[PDB]
Structure formats: C-alpha cells, structure tokens
mmCIF file of C-alpha atoms and ligand atoms in Angstrom:
data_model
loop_
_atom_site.group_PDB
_atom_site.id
_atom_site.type_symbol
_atom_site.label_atom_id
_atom_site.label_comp_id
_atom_site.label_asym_id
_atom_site.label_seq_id
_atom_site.Cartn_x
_atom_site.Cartn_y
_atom_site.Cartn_z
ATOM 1 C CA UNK C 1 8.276 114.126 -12.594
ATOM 2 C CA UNK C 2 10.262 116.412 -10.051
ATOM 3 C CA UNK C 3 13.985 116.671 -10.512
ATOM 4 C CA UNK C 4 16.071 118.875 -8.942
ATOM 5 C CA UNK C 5 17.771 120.760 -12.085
ATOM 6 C CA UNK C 6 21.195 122.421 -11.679
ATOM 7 C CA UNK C 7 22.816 119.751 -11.064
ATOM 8 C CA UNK C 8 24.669 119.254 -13.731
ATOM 9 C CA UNK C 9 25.732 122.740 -15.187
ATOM 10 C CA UNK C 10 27.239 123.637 -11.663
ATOM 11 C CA UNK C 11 29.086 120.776 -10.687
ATOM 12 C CA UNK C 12 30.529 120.972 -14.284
ATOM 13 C CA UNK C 13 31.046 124.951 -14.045
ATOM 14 C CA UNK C 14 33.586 123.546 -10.843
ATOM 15 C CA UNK C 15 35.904 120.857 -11.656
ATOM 16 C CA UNK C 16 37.935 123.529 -10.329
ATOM 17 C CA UNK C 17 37.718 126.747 -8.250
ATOM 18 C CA UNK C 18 34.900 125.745 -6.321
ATOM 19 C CA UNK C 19 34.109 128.320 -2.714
ATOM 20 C CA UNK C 20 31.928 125.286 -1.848
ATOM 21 C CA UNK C 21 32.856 121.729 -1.165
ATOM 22 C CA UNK C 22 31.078 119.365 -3.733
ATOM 23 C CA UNK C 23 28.696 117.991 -0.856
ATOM 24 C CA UNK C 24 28.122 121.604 0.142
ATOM 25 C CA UNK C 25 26.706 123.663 -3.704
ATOM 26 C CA UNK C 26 24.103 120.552 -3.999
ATOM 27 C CA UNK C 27 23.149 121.271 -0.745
ATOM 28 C CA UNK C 28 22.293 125.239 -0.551
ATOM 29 C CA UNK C 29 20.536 124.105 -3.357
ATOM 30 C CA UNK C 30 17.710 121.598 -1.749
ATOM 31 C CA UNK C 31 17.074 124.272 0.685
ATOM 32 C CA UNK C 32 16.014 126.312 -1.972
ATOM 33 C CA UNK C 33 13.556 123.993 -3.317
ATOM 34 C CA UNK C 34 12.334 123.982 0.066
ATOM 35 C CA UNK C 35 11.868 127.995 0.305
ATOM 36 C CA UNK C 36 10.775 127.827 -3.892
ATOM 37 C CA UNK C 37 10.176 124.659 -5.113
ATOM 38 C CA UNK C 38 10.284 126.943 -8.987
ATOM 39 C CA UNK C 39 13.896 127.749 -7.913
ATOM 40 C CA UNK C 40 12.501 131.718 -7.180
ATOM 41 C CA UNK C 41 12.964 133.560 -4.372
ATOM 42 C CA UNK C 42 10.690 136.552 -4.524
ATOM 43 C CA UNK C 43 11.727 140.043 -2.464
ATOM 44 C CA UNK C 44 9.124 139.512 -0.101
ATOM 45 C CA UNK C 45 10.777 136.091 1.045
ATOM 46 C CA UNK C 46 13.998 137.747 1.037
ATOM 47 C CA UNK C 47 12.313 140.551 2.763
ATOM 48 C CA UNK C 48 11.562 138.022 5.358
ATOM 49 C CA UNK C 49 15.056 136.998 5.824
ATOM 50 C CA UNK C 50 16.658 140.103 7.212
ATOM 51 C CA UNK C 51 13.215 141.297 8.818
ATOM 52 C CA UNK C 52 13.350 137.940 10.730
ATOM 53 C CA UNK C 53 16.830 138.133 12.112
ATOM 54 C CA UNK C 54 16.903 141.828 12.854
ATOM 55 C CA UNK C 55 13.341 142.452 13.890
ATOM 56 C CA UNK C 56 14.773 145.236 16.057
ATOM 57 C CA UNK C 57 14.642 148.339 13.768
ATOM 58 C CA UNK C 58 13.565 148.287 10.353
ATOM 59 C CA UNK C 59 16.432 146.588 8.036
ATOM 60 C CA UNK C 60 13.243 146.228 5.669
ATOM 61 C CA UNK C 61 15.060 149.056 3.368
ATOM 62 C CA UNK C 62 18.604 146.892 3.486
ATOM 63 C CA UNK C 63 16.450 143.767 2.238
ATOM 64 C CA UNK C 64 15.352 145.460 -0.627
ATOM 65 C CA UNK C 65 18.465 146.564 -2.106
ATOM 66 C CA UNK C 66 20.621 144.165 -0.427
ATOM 67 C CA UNK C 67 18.163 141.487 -2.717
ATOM 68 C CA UNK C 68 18.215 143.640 -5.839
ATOM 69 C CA UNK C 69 22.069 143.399 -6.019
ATOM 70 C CA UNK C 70 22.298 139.645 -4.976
ATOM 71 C CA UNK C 71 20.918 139.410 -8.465
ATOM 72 C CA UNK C 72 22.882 140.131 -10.422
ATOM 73 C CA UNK C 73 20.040 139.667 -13.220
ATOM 74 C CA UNK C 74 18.337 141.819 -11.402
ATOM 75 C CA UNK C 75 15.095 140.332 -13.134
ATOM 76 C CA UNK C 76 12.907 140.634 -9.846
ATOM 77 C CA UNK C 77 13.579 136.948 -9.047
ATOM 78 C CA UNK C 78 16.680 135.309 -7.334
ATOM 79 C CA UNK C 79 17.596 131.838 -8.581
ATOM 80 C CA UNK C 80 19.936 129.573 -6.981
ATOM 81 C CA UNK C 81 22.967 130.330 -9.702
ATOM 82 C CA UNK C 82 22.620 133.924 -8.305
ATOM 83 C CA UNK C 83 21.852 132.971 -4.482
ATOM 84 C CA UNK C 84 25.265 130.456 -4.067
ATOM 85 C CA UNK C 85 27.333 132.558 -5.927
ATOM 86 C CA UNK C 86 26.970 135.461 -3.625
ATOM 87 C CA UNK C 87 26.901 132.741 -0.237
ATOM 88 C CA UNK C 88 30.873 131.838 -1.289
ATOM 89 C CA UNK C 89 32.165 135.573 -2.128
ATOM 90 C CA UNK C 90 30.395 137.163 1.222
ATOM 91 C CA UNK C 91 32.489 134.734 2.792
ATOM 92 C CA UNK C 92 35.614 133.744 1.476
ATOM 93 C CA UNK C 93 37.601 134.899 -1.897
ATOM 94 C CA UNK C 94 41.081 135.618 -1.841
ATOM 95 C CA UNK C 95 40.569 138.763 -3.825
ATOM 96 C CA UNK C 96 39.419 142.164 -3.717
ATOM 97 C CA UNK C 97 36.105 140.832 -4.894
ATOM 98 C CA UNK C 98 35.018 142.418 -1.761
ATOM 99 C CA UNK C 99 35.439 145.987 -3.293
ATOM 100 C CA UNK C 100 33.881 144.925 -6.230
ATOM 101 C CA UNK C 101 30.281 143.003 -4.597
ATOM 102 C CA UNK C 102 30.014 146.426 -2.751
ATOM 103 C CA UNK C 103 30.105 148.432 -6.007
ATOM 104 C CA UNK C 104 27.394 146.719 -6.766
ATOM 105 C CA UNK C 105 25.726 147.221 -3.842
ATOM 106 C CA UNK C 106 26.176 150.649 -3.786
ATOM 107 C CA UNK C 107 24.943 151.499 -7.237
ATOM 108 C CA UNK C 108 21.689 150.932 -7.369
ATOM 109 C CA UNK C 109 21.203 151.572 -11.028
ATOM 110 C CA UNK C 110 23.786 149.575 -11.300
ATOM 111 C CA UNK C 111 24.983 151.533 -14.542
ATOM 112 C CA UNK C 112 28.555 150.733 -14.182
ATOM 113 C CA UNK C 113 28.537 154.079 -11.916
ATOM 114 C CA UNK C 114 26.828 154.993 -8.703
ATOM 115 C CA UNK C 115 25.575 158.086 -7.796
ATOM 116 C CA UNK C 116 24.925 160.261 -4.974
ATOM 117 C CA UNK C 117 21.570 159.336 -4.500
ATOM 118 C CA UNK C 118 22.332 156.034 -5.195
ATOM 119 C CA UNK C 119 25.175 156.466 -1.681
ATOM 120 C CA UNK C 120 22.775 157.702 -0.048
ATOM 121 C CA UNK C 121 20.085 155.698 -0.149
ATOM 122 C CA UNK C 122 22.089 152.498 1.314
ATOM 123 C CA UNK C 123 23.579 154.385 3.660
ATOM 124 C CA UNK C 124 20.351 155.530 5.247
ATOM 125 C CA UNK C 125 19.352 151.985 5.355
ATOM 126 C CA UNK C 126 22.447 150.761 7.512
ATOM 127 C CA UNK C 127 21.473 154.358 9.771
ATOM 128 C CA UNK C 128 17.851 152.328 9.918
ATOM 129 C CA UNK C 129 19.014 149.410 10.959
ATOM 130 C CA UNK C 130 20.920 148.700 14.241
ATOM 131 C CA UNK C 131 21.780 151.243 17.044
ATOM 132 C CA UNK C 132 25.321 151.384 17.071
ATOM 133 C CA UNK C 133 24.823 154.585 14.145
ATOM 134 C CA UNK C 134 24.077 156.368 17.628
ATOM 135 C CA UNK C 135 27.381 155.460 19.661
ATOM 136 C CA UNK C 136 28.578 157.012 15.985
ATOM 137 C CA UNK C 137 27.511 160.619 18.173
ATOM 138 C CA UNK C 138 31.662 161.261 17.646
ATOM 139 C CA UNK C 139 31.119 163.928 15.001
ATOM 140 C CA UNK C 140 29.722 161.999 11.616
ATOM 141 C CA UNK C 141 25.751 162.991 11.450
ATOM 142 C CA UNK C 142 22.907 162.250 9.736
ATOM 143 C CA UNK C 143 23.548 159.906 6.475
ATOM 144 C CA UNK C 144 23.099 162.981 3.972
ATOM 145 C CA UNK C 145 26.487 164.328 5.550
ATOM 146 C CA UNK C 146 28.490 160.929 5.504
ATOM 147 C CA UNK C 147 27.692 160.623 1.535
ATOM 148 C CA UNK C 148 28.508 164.363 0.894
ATOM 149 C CA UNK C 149 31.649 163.974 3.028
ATOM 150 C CA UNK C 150 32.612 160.654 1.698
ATOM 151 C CA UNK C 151 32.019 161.638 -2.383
ATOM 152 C CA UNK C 152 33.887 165.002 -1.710
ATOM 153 C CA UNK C 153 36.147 162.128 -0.286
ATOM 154 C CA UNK C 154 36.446 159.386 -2.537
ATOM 155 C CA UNK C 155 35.794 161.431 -5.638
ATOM 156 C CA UNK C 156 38.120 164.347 -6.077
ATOM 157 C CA UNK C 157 37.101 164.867 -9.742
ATOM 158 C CA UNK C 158 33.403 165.822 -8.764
ATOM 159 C CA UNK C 159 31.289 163.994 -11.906
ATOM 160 C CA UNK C 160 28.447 163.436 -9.628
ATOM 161 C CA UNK C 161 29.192 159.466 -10.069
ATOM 162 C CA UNK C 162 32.489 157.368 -9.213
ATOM 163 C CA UNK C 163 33.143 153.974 -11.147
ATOM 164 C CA UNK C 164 34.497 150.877 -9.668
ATOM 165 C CA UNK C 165 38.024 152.016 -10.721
ATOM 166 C CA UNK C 166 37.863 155.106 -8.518
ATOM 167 C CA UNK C 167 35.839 153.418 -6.316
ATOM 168 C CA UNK C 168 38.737 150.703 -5.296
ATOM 169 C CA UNK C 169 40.992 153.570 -4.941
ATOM 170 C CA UNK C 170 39.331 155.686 -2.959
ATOM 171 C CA UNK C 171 38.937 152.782 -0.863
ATOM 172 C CA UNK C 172 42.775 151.310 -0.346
ATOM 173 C CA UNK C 173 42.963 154.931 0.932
ATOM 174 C CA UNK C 174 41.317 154.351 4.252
ATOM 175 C CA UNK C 175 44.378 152.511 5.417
ATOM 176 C CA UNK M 1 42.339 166.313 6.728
ATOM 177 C CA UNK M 2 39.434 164.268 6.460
ATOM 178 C CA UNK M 3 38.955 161.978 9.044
ATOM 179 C CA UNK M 4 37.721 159.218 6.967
ATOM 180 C CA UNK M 5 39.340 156.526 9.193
ATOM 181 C CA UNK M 6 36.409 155.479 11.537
ATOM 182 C CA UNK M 7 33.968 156.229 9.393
ATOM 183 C CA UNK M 8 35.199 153.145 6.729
ATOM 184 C CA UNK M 9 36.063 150.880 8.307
ATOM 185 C CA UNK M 10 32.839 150.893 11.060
ATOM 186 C CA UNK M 11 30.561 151.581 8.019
ATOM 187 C CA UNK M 12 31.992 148.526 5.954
ATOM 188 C CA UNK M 13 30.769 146.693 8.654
ATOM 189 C CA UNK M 14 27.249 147.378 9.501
ATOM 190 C CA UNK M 15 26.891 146.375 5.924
ATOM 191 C CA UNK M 16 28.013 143.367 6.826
ATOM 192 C CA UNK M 17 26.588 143.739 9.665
ATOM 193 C CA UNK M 18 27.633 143.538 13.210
ATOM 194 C CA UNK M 19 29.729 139.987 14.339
ATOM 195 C CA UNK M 20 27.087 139.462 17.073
ATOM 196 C CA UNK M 21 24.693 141.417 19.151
ATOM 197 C CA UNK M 22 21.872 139.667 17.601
ATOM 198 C CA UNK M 23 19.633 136.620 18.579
ATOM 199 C CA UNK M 24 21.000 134.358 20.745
ATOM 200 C CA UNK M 25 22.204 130.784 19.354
ATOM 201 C CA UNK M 26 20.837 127.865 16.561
ATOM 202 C CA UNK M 27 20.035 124.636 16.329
ATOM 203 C CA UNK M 28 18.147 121.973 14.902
ATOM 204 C CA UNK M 29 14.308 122.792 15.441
ATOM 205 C CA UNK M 30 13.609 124.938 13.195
ATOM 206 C CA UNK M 31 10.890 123.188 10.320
ATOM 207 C CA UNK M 32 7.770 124.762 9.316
ATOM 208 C CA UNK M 33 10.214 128.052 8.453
ATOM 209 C CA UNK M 34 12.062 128.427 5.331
ATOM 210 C CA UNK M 35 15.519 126.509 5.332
ATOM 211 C CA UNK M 36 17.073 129.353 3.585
ATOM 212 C CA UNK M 37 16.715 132.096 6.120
ATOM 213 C CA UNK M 38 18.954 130.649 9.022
ATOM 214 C CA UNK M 39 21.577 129.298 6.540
ATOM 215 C CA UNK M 40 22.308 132.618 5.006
ATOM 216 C CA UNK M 41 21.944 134.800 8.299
ATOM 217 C CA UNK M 42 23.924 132.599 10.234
ATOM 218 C CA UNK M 43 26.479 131.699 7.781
ATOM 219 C CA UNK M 44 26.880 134.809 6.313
ATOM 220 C CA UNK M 45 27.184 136.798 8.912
ATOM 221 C CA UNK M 46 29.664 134.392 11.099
ATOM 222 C CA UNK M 47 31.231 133.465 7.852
ATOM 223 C CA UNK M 48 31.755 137.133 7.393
ATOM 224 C CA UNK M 49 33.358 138.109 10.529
ATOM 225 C CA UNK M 50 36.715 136.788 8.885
ATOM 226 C CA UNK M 51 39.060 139.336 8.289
ATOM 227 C CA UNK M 52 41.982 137.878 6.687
HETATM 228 CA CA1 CA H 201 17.871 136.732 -11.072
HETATM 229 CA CA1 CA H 202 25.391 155.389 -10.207
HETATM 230 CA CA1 CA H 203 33.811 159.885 -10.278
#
C-alpha cells in the first residue's frame, strides 16, 4: 500500500559521488514523509522552518526566497530530490559550487541573470533578519546602497544584470 | 577604492547565517514537530560554519 519511493533512482544515481553516506540519503528521506507523507513540502512549512529557529526578527522574507531557489523546479513544491541535494552542497562540495547555489539565490527570476531588484530584494531580507546589520553602523547603510555599491562593484559593464560568469569574478575579487 | 572587503565576506555569511547566537542546544524530545525543521537548521547551519 505505502512505500517509500525514491529509493531506488537515488541510491542508483550514487554508486559514486555521493555528499551523503548510504545510511544517511535514505534517511533525510523518512523525515520527509514525516513532514509530507506526498513527498511535498509546501512554502508555508518551509516558512515554518526559518520562522521557528529565528523567531527573533522576521526571516519570513529569507524563507520565501531562500525556498523558491532550493527548488530548483521551482514548481511551488519541494520534493526530496530537490531538498537532499541542496542539504550536501550547503555543506560540503569541494568546488566553487558555493558561487554558483548563491547565483541562484540571488536571481530571483532565475533567468540565467539577476538583476538589481532581484539584489536587492535578498539583501533586504538578510537586513530583516538578525541584528548584527546594526553593529554594520561602520559606513555601509541601508540595503538600497549595498546593492548600488556592490553592482557598480561587481559589474563594471553596467547591463543592469550580471551572469554567473561575472558573477564568480566579481566575487574571487573580494580577496 | 571600494571598500568591498567587509562588506563580502560578513554579508556571505548572514546568508548563511550566523555560526551561533541562536537557540540554545538539541536533543532528542522533539515529536509532535516536523522532523525536517531541526535537521536542516541545525545541520545546515553547523554544517555550514566550515570554511575550508
Ligand atoms: Ca520542486
Ligand atoms: Ca536577473
Ligand atoms: Ca553584467
């Protein structure tokens, strides 16, 4: 009656890089029938998440995007596939895939490109968030001058939009 | 010339959020909650505060 699907197309998809010890994909995986026994988790569980281990401002804003980009669907609905994959990169890697999973992040649209509004808009979520933004006091202001600074920054060809290829530059700069 | 030192490096990291500074410590208790909320907190945020 009730299986457990997935659990045959993953361990298969392994048999070798694998960010997740054999015992370990199988078992994000029953948790999630627990939270969804469809294998769905909805925004407003996600939303629940992040609003229930940062009650403290209103990371509400960084639950909705930060759940829009774990999918990288982006159909509305995380599955597992989507939710394990991302559990592995935010951790470990061994590649610059950390450049890359915050391209995503920070495009929105998603459209290959991200745009100013697009920067902003996270950005004013992490300034929402936590209060370490106001020990920040050390010049640095409200988000709408961090993106302005940081485009005029990490975008020296002005197009309005950067792609990851710029993106990853502009961003080995920092060092 | 620009002064973007500070500002990428302590930005990078409230999107990953802080190391700590939050809650105080887990264990097993937890049931009537969702499963999947303390796994990904916890782990990715401790599992985060790597940096090579
Ligand atoms: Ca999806
Ligand atoms: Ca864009
Ligand atoms: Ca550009």
């Amino acid at each position: 009656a009730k299986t457990s699907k997935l659990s045959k197309d993953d361990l298969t998809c392994l048999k070798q890089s694998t960010y997740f010890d054999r015992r370990e994909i199988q078992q994000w995986h029953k948790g999630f029938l627990r939270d969804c026994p469809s294998g769905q988790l909805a925004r407003e569980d996600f939303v629940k998440i992040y609003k229930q281990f940062f009650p403290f401002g209103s990371p509400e804003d960084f639950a909705n995007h930060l759940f829009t980009v774990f999918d990288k669907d982006n159909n509305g609905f995380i599955h597992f596939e989507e939710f394990i994959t991302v559990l592995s990169t935010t951790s470990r890697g061994t590649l610059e895939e950390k450049l890359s999973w915050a391209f995503e992040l920070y495009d929105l649209n998603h459209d290959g490109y991200i745009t100013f509004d697009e920067m902003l808009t996270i950005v004013a979520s992490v300034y929402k968030m936590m209060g370490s933004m106001v020990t920040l006091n050390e010049d640095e202001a409200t988000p709408e001058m961090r993106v302005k600074k940081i485009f005029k920054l990490m975008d020296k060809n002005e197009d309005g939009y950067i792609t990851l290829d710029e993106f990853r530059e502009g961003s080995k700069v920092d060092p | 010339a620009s002064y973007g030192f500070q500002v990428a490096r302590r930005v990078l990291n409230n999107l990953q959020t802080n190391l700590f500074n939050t809650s105080s410590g887990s264990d097993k208790n937890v049931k009537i909650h969702e499963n999947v909320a303390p796994a990904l907190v916890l782990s990715s945020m401790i599992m985060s505060a790597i940096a090579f």
